[PDB]
């Protein structure tokens, strides 16, 4: 392993929202597979399923169009029609709180799922453990 192995509580029962505290957005999956956040609570597209592969790795999927989550090979977030490696992030609590979500392609370079105060995604490489861009909460539909 690259990484620890605090896991967060909650499960995959039901759909979740991905709050990021740095700007207050929700992940969202647009339909033609950019990725960005948006403040908007009521928006079709930030509503995500996220289900277990192995414990503590997980696919996060959008429930309006079935695409997955994936960070590409130069670490931007896109969505995937189709379930593949890019797809897979390890899922782990941070400061005994937040949820974390680390590529699993590429871990040993502590690439994240983030998003900035603006609302866009970080891209891998920019993100690092300590960032407040990389701390989400999940929340109810």
């Given at each position: 392993h690259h990484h620890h192995f605090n896991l967060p509580p909650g499960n995959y029962k039901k759909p979740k929202l991905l709050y990021?505290?740095?700007?207050?957005h929700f992940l969202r999956i647009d339909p033609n597979g950019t990725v960005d956040g948006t403040?908007?609570?009521?928006?079709?597209?930030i509503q995500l399923q996220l289900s277990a592969e192995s414990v503590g790795e997980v696919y996060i999927k959008?429930?309006?169009?079935?695409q997955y989550l994936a960070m590409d090979t130069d670490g931007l977030l896109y969505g995937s029609q189709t379930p593949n490696e890019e797809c897979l992030f390890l899922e782990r609590l941070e400061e005994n709180h937040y949820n974390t979500y680390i590529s699993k392609k590429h871990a040993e370079k502590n690439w994240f799922v983030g998003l900035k105060k603006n609302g866009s995604c970080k891209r891998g490489p920019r993100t690092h453990y300590?960032?407040?861009?990389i701390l989400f909460l999940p929340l109810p539909v």
């Open positions: 990021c505290s740095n700007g207050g403040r908007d609570r009521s928006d079709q597209h959008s429930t309006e169009t079935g300590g960032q407040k861009a």
